[model samples]
Target: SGIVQQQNNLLRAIEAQQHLLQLTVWGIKQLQARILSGGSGGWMEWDREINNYTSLIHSLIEESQNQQEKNEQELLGGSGGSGIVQQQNNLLRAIEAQQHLLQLTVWGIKQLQARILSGGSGGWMEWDREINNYTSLIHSLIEESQNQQEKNEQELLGGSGGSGIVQQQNNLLRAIEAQQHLLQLTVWGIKQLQARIL
Candidate 1:
């Protein structure tokens, strides 16, 4: 999903650059017509102006292409980590980081579930601190998102009421689903970590 998002962003950047280039060319044509028809003597002087605009567009396209290439290479890079034990050490670090985050996430989820079950509170003394902190953070995020979302709801549902309604509904739904998933995965991870620790 991350890679797809990156690719989509790149595609949009490329398309925008193409659109800008097309518009610049059209503007230059209009300028040329006006200048040749005795509209202004500044047309010839400003002829090199379009050159700079075109160069900027070309540079943007090149940069986007380079970014895409770099991302592609990273995605498809071959694994050759057999030199020393450093590769193993790196793998361990990666696993530890990922596992730690997963465990934390799981802890957060379990706490959320407990809160739901107990009317926004829990009784697990051992996990109390973890639960409190995690739930607070989650609540803050949800509240923040809701506040921002409501603020932008009008813009989201502008003139095209039906489409805007649909978009806003879908946006909220996606956010809810993402949060639920994050919580679930985290909870499961924490449970697994506990078992391992035991």
Candidate 2:
């Protein structure tokens, strides 16, 4: 399958890098807890927030996957008139949102680490559930990013081949610059037209 190629270098490294992100966050959680004295106030707020972010992340990931599945399946898929934006624009949004989630995630992990190392958890059960699930979460989000990238690349007739798709798998940082390239006169039309999906 063409999917195999998506799994090539850029894809594999990102997977491991993201997977390590989860591990690093957890290890940071533990490391700080061990070295510090522990915290008292505002932790409940921290706990519940992590919980909330978890829910929202799952929701976002699910929506992105469903949108892609719809593309494969098509009025939906069949309309040469075609109803879905299923374009780089949407893919860019999905990937950036995931990146945003990852960015925000470290805050909670770091704070949690502070408490556990300084203090600790029967809390272990909760932490266990969280760290374990993060792996699964990243896998789906990674797939969504890649799947969307494939669509974006083909739609552009491979202008994305040299820089966009290749760098996409390499790192997400250029979602800013790389995504800028993704947007053209057609992209202008895409946003205006598909603004309806919002």
Candidate 3:
């Protein structure tokens, strides 16, 4: 539905520009046709027509510009990437970085498991040093994900409320859902390992 309307607005903008072009060209062509044959009276009618139509044409131009900027220019242009594209890209990085954090914790857990099971109890010193860092990084990614959720919510409420937007945001949340699940698994791994630590 929204895509339909966007195209329609784009259509009106193009049509509006061509309409003005035709009107002006025709007005010029007729200007020398009668060479004052109808006096200023004919020109006045043309003037009136131009004035009347242009008032409406102004709206189509502005409306289409707004639509394009809000939706399209986001990808095609943005200084410093601080515009619309920035927000979406930021969410992806958060998701990506979180994935690595989870992986690091899981691998650490496994290495610790192997070391302990094989009789190397000295690994905890480095692992303990790494623990606080992992927790903090999760918290950092945690903030990015929640802030992303709020932005997604706003887009859904505003963008004609599309199910695509709903699904897109859910996908973001699901991206974090895996983060949380792995985070929990890592937590469990840590504690379970601790129980057997000497």
Candidate 4:
């Protein structure tokens, strides 16, 4: 009796895994696809941002070079305009800060673009591993449980008439109750979903 109970518990546990696996597989496929597609789009956006940053950096560099040439020309012409030198210094500081920020923004976008593929593929692999192991174990246990139940039934039915009928009815009732529990669980799971299910 204890052995059969243990087997029943194992079978129920496997059934739960089967249900979870079905939902997980369905969800994982769609999520994986979305992530992969978004990852490609992210790369494209990052490329555009990088190009913009590069152009800005070049412009800033040119401005700084032009300012230096102007200062040299002013000094050679004997015009000591301290105000002009101070203004050029301020412009240089502003342009240098903006260039640094642009570079930082480009680097941030690149990091984000790289993360999508890594994160998406990693999650897909993990889900696949979990589903595969559970599937294999459930299949093996199901076959073994069926074989054992059949063998036990044969032995039980070989005995006295009334006892065999009573035991069989009891087993049927237990099956009905398990099915009811599973149905309730299924409805509960469906209620948690936001999308319509046909």
Candidate 5:
């Protein structure tokens, strides 16, 4: 009975870890879509964030696989080690933190997009309403793009051809700067998480 309970617990723990990994992957895909279609001129800048996240994800995957191999060896040797459990728990906690960071990164991008689309409305209430509407629109578009197969990524990321609307273009420039700052912060957070794991 004791041996069975330990095995069951280990299985359950593995299942939870897998679920978190799936969520992390989905979040990565969403970010990739946004980065790819965001704007052509800014692609070079945003590409850094995408690359950082990809590296972090790959590192985590490698670590998890290494731990899995250790766990398998211990099981085959009839040694139920608590060290394996500790490592799994630690990895799960790190992944959960990662999930939160990724979510905030996504939200920051949406907020930046909304602000850009609002065109710097002068009044607070008017600006608030416009930003809210733009945010919803952007969110819907992201969802649709994820579901469909289209290279709209190029269409959106391509430099917004000069519209001769100076104010709108200025707002977009400022928003892109702010979005880059947000991504930098997220990358830092991921680095901290990586340090803890290492």
Candidate 6:
């Protein structure tokens, strides 16, 4: 029964990771299309960021597979096996990390989209609104991921040692907060640029 529960939790976590990974790959392609369509100065910089994220996601894909293998090994090795909880904790960490990165990537795309639209002709207003809508959706997903990660951490901590898990989650929170601040600065800069131009 304990093993079954563990397997189910791991399965859900893997599904979440795959969903985020798919979103990431989709975002990368979208950025690539903008670059091919003759992206502007701001977009070229965003393209570089996207390229970096793409590499990160590729590594994440490999890591996810390795994690899956470790999970399976832990399961097959039985309940008394060492590091099984550690492996599960690692999966949760990966899931949260992937979700946060996706959020940042989506936010970055929105920032670029806003910049591009701001530089375009008058009729781009509707497109800007559309981008904002997508940004909201991505932000909501980020919040959902945070909640899911917290719940998983709680579940894992029920009968186990939790210092590492607690520390890792705190680290993730700090990273996300810093990233949000950086994103806001970029948005503010875009606003200043737009005011100067318009």
Compute each candidate's TM-score over C-alphas.
Answer: 0.30, 0.38, 0.36, 0.28, 0.35, 0.42
Q: Give per-residue CA lDDT, model 5, range 1-198, as digits (tens).
A: 333243334344434544543454444345445434545545444446545654665566566566666766777788745434334333443333343344445444434434333343334344345445544443443333232212222224322432222222233223323333434444443333233332
In candidate 1, which residue ranges exceed 4 Å CA deviation?
16-20, 27-41, 77-198
Model 1 C-alpha lDDT per residue in residues 39-131, reported as the tens digit of each score: 354434344544554455455455545555555555566422211122112222222222233333343334334422343223345354544
Estimate every model's Cα lDDT from 0 to 1: 0.39, 0.41, 0.46, 0.39, 0.41, 0.49
- Model 1 steric clash pairs: 105-186, 106-186, 106-187
lDDT of 3 by residue, 73-112 (tens): 5444432222222333344443454344345444445554
Q: Write the per-residue lDDT of candidate 6 for residues 1-198, one digit (tens) a residue.
A: 444344345445445545545554454445546544535435566556656755664565466466556656666775433344444445444444544455555455455456454554543455456445544654554565456456654565533764543443444344344434434433443444344333
Off by over 4 Å in 2: 1-21, 37-45, 75-93, 105-173, 176-198
List RMSD in Å for every model shown: 27.1, 16.2, 30.4, 35.3, 21.9, 9.7
Worst 10 residues of 4 by lDDT: 189-198
Indicate which candidate wins on lDDT: 6
- Candidate 6 residue-wise lDDT at 3: 40
Question: Which has the better lDDT: candidate 1, or candidate 6?
Answer: 6
Among all windows of ten consecutive residues in candidate 3, which has the lowest summed lDDT?
A: 78-87
lDDT of 2 by residue, 127-165 (tens): 435544544455454566566566654665344234554
In model 4, residue pairs whose N, Cα or C atoms come closer than 3 Å (at least 3 residues apart or on different chains), thus clashing, are none
Q: Sorted by TM-score, highest first, which candidate order results? A: 6, 2, 3, 5, 1, 4
Best-performing candidate as measured by TM-score: 6
**Cα-lDDT of candidate 2:** 0.41
Error of 1 at 9 (Å): 3.1
Model 6: residues >4 Å from true position, as ranges? 1-42, 112-198
Question: What's the C-alpha lDDT at position 181 in model 6?
Answer: 44
Clashing pairs in 5: 39-157, 40-157
* CA error at residue 8 for candidate 4, angstroms: 84
